[PDB]
């Protein structure tokens, strides 16, 4: 019955969704192109559109989709800052998402970035691979005993905090809604500025909203402990990357791990190595020995993908039965 | 200025030891060469020799050292499988070590290898560096819920077990002397073969002895779960690397992280990139997308190095006060 | 509106062929799969099949193609060792090729491999990229004055010779046939074993036939000048790659540049980086600092591709008109 | 009755320097001291008491350095290099400090390297190597072009530029040339002299082989890049300051410049010849140049061949012996 058009489709998306669809028999169409004003016409006549985090679901796109017959927007993601939710509501277009496919996948990836940066595992790998077994510049630091500041102690942030507590770190936390689980781990809540000044490692797990946009700016970087590590597996626009470059150059910021980037939408998820990279700031970030960028793969585990696909297909079935689930606000 | 000769010296060694020697004023000499039968003559007239894990302290070397006037052997390491302890004892040469400079350094490195392999971070890095933001082949797996088998639950193995429990892993353990802290974490002890057959990830933290040599061989790899991950931050000779190659090629072994290698002694710690690598087995291990080798750097953190230098210099001061500590015995 | 089925099609092939002005109203179909016994059925009802150098055109494949209605085999290549020519002839299936799309493209690539190996440019690139501006191991040698031995002085060999003469190299040559252009360049013909013993650099440009198969074997490697450079942009089976590995490890062979490899057929032209590489010998060749392998891209220039497409489309038109051109004969 | 004292301090010394110079010194027995640091105002004191100082291309031999060296007893400055833009020759002369150099150790070593950069860029050999090393045997993005038939413009047809031109003519390239002082050997070769702007507009590949002087400084600037053929290749094995690298970045990003090979960089002096991989790179412009797939940078190694090194060492030790006997050779003058 039901027909679903997926934008920004990759092979991992079709594999996982085709496996999960043995339980549903929806008719699945995978389109590679990003959703934007000039591709929305591809969804003409599709009742359901399945979008990912760098699809453009601003007002003009939503208007096109609604006018073309689309009646549900299914986000195969937890995040939803790319959707104009007020406009969806005005158009009577429900928006559904997958709020907790695997908080562990994302938290673990953040911990992986930390360790790769700390022990210079990315540099080591390239050395041993060519028969360079020298260790200059690879000396790391013990995680045990360090102060780890978590900004945003929700599903992912809390899971990240628990892992880091298991390394014997001292947890510092900031959230407008503190939670008791963090305290039970030994964490202590404090104000943002104090967290920044006291943390050896900071990790961002708050959503992107008007209040978190450029939360990490020049001013705030200058507050941080010299040589600190910053991890961003949240959203690119949580940080001002031009300011990160200056702090990296001065040594003020010791390490940076990114799984997201502010201008990632038209570059991530494809191989653009054959052409010059246009984004000056990203190119410069990539040049540093103490920066690691992964291309928005913190979600990318077998279990995460299976849960995304199962929950998304269930969301759609629930909507089709008139009892929708996992709606976004 | 008591005189200490350091073999296999690297810049990080002379830097850390020099900083720590502000509190002692020993006279420190750093030799780059490895200690072996051929190089032992360099220690003539040195009362104290400081060696590392790839120096050869077998009987013939210890005999030369003793004949040349050396009276103490200070290991700037926790491990001591490179020392013939019976022969040291017969010669009246005490051997001292640093047993617990930082169990966390080594455990954390093992967990780093696990995550790099899992999320293919070493491959991702190289891709994004050149503007390849594609994700094919990089899908990993949640650590939460997996079974992690720890072989050797001592200072490092236990610290590793604790970290992995914090990711929500199910801990399985094998040690001739089980310890209660592991059970308090939720770990369950079992026999070696059962641990191998049931684990998704296996990590080696037992010392190298005649009983652990080639513990992971062809037969034991075949009993492991298909696609499992094996981590070796112990010693090279705990595994048979030729058998690892065959299991990697078949897919039987899904991942391998090594910080040690059986024939590392004359290879590691130096940049040999300008010449062909002679060792066929290491070259082949290095060829795989699901193998990561680090060059015996699990011990290499600021805190580990400072503790190694401080404890080693203190060990030597204690010896020279007639109250030796951190001795290793036959 | 004759239809053409292309096997082993890559994006650069379909772009190339579609952008030609020489379509002659043909209908072009591009299949990615390699031609072999179990894919030949895809050509059922196609009058013309276009194949590349790693397609299987042995007798059983040719029999299927003829039984399925294919009447012409068009090689988008110069080389034809992959074709059983006697069997094609017995089936009345003409085979056409492109013998001289661009001898310069291929010769220039060989020269590129030479310079890369000499100046260690592949190593330098990765160093500078990460801010390593050190030069240890990168010292090269002046080409000017060196002896360059060319095995096979045909279209590509003589173009290569000509380029190497322009660097002021001394040219040595071996071919069953004299070529007066080689003498005009200053080249001297000599016997194979003498060429091998006297040359600083050797480059292979003979076709693969039963007489050139494994021309470079253990015994002939041992005759070469110690530390010499060997370049192979001919065909993989001209050399014995297991013997190349031993000579590289001993230092007897100083450098190796390959654009071709004996078991390339099912490996080259794809990205196989996500899985272990099965071929031990290729994995080991890839491990060396003084080996460069490119994946059969010597033909791969803008001008070469355009000529291959134009000449191949013309060859097919000329066959259709009953005046065939560029036939290869048993 | 037959021959059977002299102390030399080398700045910016590397292992390949002490090895080559020690081999050549079997013929002399001078006393050789190798210092790693770069020569500049605050390291000049290390040459106190040394009659001879041997410097390389990134040592600072401006007036204030030369004044310290002279005051400290140094009597000869021996450049282990062909180039000399780093020396204030008028100041050396005013101080009575002769400066000697090695003008032609191996013009082939440098020309050949430039050709290597061309071919690596053209066939993407650097990209292919990293692919095949990890089992990626795909060829997308690696299509090159035939050199045969292309136009190659040589700016500066001296020893190196002429050797380069001859090599490129052997590939069947058409040679275009610009030099304020044309020479007949290039024409005899089939090369055609023309004005700079016309060379820039007509060339598929341009290679710089002029010295750095006040007239060649930023010779390749934004305006001259905009004159070039779209998608052209530029090669710089001359000096860093011959080009404006910020403008090269904009032309690379637009596609106006198709390829860039550098063996030299304007701010190289305090970074090249060292492994600086363990720290951030401070220079924004170099970091960005390094990011591109169609840029290759080698760290000033065009001179670096066995034969070049042996000639530099032999000629440099000979220049010092000749000076010591009062009959100096290979002097450079203001
Ligand atoms: N890189 C990746 O692949 C993925 C990234 N993400 C990002 O992670 C974010 C977090 O996801 P969850 O933890 O699941 O969400 P959640 O809703 O469980 O938790 C978010 C937390 O952030 C806090 N928060 C809100 N505003 C804040 C502010 N101004 N300052 C500090 N904290 C604030 C909330 O109070 C809440 O505790 C998502 O918004 C998404 O952008 C999510 C999934 C994958
Ligand atoms: N990669 C690196 O840089 C470093 C490696 N190591 C290695 O790790 C090893 C372990 O270190 P620690 O935890 O400090 O030692 P430990 O002595 O504290 O603990 C070792 C554990 O191994 C167990 N064990 C002994 N024999 C066994 C057997 N046959 N089978 C299974 N388990 C057995 C012991 O009962 C003990 O619980 C060292 O012996 C050394 O080789 C140590 C430091 C650094
Ligand atoms: N890497 C690549 O992409 C390419 C490789 N090739 C290979 O290069 C080969 C050469 O092609 P061309 O120069 O065009 O061919 P060609 O036919 O013009 O010249 C071949 C020469 O090799 C000589 N030769 C034949 N048998 C010989 C033997 N037994 N020993 C020594 N020399 C012998 C012939 O006398 C002739 O002079 C092709 O057969 C092909 O395999 C060709 C094009 C591209
Ligand atoms: N990358 C490297 O490792 C090396 C670089 N070089 C550089 O290459 C340069 C060339 O050296 P050689 O060819 O031996 O010098 P050379 O003196 O023989 O020739 C230089 C040529 O440039 C020409 N020229 C002078 N002023 C010019 C101007 N304003 N515009 C255009 N052309 C002009 C000259 O007339 C002469 O024909 C050296 O000055 C040096 O900076 C030299 C050696 C090694």
Output the domain CATH number for residue C108.
3.40.50.720
Contact C24/D at CB under 8 A: no
CA-based nearest residue to C48, from C98, C3, C95: C3
C18, with CB counted inside 10 A (0-12, 13-18, 19+), is exposed
CB D35 within 8 A of CB D9: yes
Distance between CA atoms of residues B282 and B179, nearest Å: 35
Tokens for C45, please give them.
Answer: 């009802």
Length of chain D: 334
* Cα C207 to averaged position of ligand 3 atoms, centre (Å): 4
> Which ligand has the nearest atom to the CA of B305?
2
C30 sits in which H/E element: strand C27-30
CA-based nearest residue to A118, from A63, A3, A200: A200
Distance between CA atoms of residues C50 and C38, nearest Å: 17
Q: Which residues of D touch C111 (CB under 8 A)?
A: 119
Contact D23/C at CB under 8 A: no
Cβ neighbour number for residue D34 with a 10 Å cutoff? 17
CA distance C279 to chain B (A): 10
Are A131 and B272 a contacting pair at CB < 8 A? yes
What is the residue range of D76's domain? 1-106+304-334
Are C142 and D307 a contacting pair at CB < 8 A? yes
C117, with CB counted inside 10 A (0-12, 13-18, 19+), is buried
Contact B67/C at CB under 8 A: no
Structure-derived torsion over alpha carbons of residues B83, B87, B93, B97, reported in degrees to the nearest 10: 20
- Token pair 């290749």 is found at D233
CB C58 within 8 A of CB C87: yes
Contact B289/D at CB under 8 A: yes
Q: What angle do CA A153, A142, A117 make, to 5 degrees?
A: 70
Alpha carbons within 13 angstroms on the beta-carbon side of residue C27 total 5
Tokens for B306, please give them.
Answer: 């400072």
Contact A289/D at CB under 8 A: yes
Question: Is C122 known to be catalytic?
Answer: no
Distance between CA atoms of residues C8 and C18, nearest Å: 16
CB nearest D293 (choices: B123, B126, B130): B130
**Does the annotation list A252 as a binding residue?**
no
Same domain, D145 and D227: yes
Same domain, C182 and C330: no
Distance between CA atoms of residues C298 and C259, nearest Å: 7
Helix (H, G, I), strand (E, B) or coil at C86: helix
CB B284 within 8 A of CB B245: yes
Give chain D's domain count: 2
* Cα D188 to averaged position of ligand 4 atoms, centre (Å): 20
Are D281 and A273 a contacting pair at CB < 8 A? no
Question: Is D218 known to be catalytic?
Answer: no
User: Over the range B165-203, which residues count as b (16 or more CB within 10 Å of their CB) and which as e?
Assistant: bbbbbbbbbbbeeebeebeebebbbbeeeebbebbbbbb
Residue of D nearest to A251 (CA): D280
CA-CA distances (angstroms) from residue A19 to A13, A28, A97, A308, B264? 10, 11, 19, 12, 45
Same domain, C285 and C247: yes
CB C182 within 8 A of CB C153: yes
CA-CA distances (angstroms) from residue B61 to A24, B38, B49, B55? 72, 9, 12, 10
* Cα D210 to averaged position of ligand 4 atoms, centre (Å): 3
Same domain, A275 and A166: yes
Strand order in the sheet with C48-51: C27-30, C3-6, C48-51, C72-75, C95-96
* Cα C114 to averaged position of ligand 4 atoms, centre (Å): 26
- Among the listed residues C296, C302, C327, C329, the single catalytic one is C296
Instruction: Please report the residues numbered 173 through 212 in chain D whose beta carbons come closer than 8 angstroms to any beta carbon of chain C.
Output: none
Same domain, C49 and C110: no
Cβ neighbours for D223, distance < 8 A, ≥ 6 positions apart: none
Residues in contact with ligand 3 by the CB-under-6-Å rule are C 78-79, 103, 106, 151-157, 175-177, 205-208, 211-212, 233-235, 259-260, 296, 298-299
* Cα A153 to averaged position of ligand 1 atoms, centre (Å): 8
- Token pair 């007509």 is found at D202
- Token pair 């192979």 is found at C232
Same domain, D203 and D67: no
- Assign 3-class secondary structure to chain D: CCCCCCEEEECCCCHHHHHHHHHHHHHCCCEEEECCCCCCCCCHHHHCCCCEEEECCCCCECHHHHHHHHHCCCCEEEECCCCCCCECHHHHHHCCCCEECCCCCCHHHHHHHHHHHHHHHHHCHHHHHHHHHCCECCCCCCCECCCCCCEEEEECCCHHHHHHHHHHHHCCCEEEEECCCCCHHHHHCCCEECCHHHHHHHCCEEEECCCCCCCCCCCECHHHHHHCCCCEEEEECCCHHHECHHHHHHHHHHCCEEEEEECCCCCCCCCCCCECCCCCCCCHHHHHHHHCCCEEECCCCCCCEHHHHHHHHHHHHHHHHHHHCCCCCCECCC
Touching chains, D (3+ CB pairs < 8 A):
A, B, C
Contact B166/C at CB under 8 A: no
Distance between CA atoms of residues D48 and D34, nearest Å: 14
Q: Which residues of A touch D284 (CB under 8 A)?
A: 284
Distance between CA atoms of residues D208 and D220, nearest Å: 9
Distance between CA atoms of residues D321 and D334, nearest Å: 23
Q: What is the DSSP letter of A139?
A: -
Helices C121-129 + D107-123 axis angle, to 10: 70
Residue of C nearest to A289 (CA): C130
CA distance C248 to chain A (A): 15
Same domain, C293 and C308: no
CA distance D138 to chain C (A): 5
Q: What is the DSSP letter of C199?
A: -
Residues in contact with ligand 4 by the CB-under-6-Å rule are D 82-83, 110, 155-161, 179-181, 209-212, 215-216, 237-239, 263-264, 300, 302-303
Provide the annotated binding site of C for NADH: 155-156, 175, 233, 259, 299
Cβ neighbours for C222, distance < 8 A, ≥ 6 positions apart: C247, C252
- Token pair 């990279």 is found at A277
Are A287 and D291 a contacting pair at CB < 8 A? yes
Same domain, D172 and D64: no
Tokens for B170, please give them.
Answer: 């199910």
- Token pair 């910016």 is found at D12
Cβ neighbours for A121, distance < 8 A, ≥ 6 positions apart: A115, B112, B113, B116, B121, B122, B292, B294
β-sheet bridge partners, residue B228: B253
> Which ligand has the nearest atom to the CA of C207?
3
- Give the number of beta-carbon pairs within 8 Å between A and D: 46
* Gyration radius from chain A CA atoms: 21
Question: Is C235 known to be catalytic?
Answer: yes
Strand order in the sheet with B170-174: B188-189, B170-174, B147-151, B201-204, B228-232, B253-258, B291-293
Cβ neighbours for B90, distance < 8 A, ≥ 6 positions apart: none
β-sheet bridge partners, residue D259: D233
Q: Pick the residue of D16, D115, D132, D261 with the most C CBs within 10 A to test the interface with C by mutation.
A: D132
Distance between CA atoms of residues D149 and B14, nearest Å: 59
* Gyration radius from chain C CA atoms: 21
Same domain, B199 and B278: yes
Residue of A nearest to B292 (CA): A125
Q: Which residues of D touch A136 (CB under 8 A)?
A: 278
Same domain, C215 and C83: no
- Among the listed residues C108, C235, C327, C329, the single catalytic one is C235
Tokens for A31, please give them.
Answer: 């389109």
Same domain, C72 and C82: yes
Same domain, A309 and A290: no
Helix (H, G, I), strand (E, B) or coil at A177: coil
Contact D233/C at CB under 8 A: no
């Amino acid at each position: 019955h039901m027909r679903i058009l997926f934008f920004s489709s990759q092979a991992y998306d079709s594999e996982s969704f085709q496996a999960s669809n043995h339980r549903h028999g929806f008719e699945l169409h995978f389109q590679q192109a990003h959703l934007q004003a000039d591709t929305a016409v591809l969804a003409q006549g599709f009742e359901v559109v399945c979008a990912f985090v760098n699809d453009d679901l601003s007002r003009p796109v939503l208007e096109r989709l609604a006018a073309g017959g689309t009646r549900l927007v299914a986000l195969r993601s937890a995040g939803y800052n790319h959707v104009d939710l007020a406009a969806a509501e005005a158009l009577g277009l429900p928006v559904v998402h997958v709020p907790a496919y695997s908080p562990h996948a994302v938290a673990e990836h953040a911990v992986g970035l930390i360790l790769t940066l700390n022990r210079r595992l990315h540099r080591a790998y390239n050395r041993t691979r060519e028969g360079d077994f020298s260790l200059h510049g690879l000396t790391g630091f013990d995680l045990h005993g360090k102060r780890v500041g978590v900004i945003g102690t929700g599903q992912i942030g809390e899971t990240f905090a628990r892992i880091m507590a298991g390394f014997g770190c001292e947890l510092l936390a900031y959230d407008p809604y503190p939670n008791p689980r963090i305290q039970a781990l030994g964490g202590r809540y404090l104000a943002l500025d104090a967290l920044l000044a006291e943390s050896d490692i900071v990790s961002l797990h708050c959503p992107l909203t008007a209040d978190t946009r450029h939360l990490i700016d020049a001013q705030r970087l200058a507050t941080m402990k010299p040589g600190a590590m910053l991890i961003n597996t949240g959203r690119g626009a949580l940080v001002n990357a031009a300011a990160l470059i200056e702090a990296l150059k001065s040594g003020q910021l010791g390490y940076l791990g990114l799984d997201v980037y502010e201008e990632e939408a038209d570059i991530f998820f494809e191989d653009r190595s054959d052409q010059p990279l246009q984004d000056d700031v990203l190119a410069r970030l990539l040049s540093f020995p103490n920066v690691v960028v992964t291309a928005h793969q913190a979600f990318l585990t077998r279990e995460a993908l299976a849960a995304i696909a199962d929950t998304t297909l269930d969301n759609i079935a629930a909507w089709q039965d008139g009892t929708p689930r996992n709606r976004v606000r």
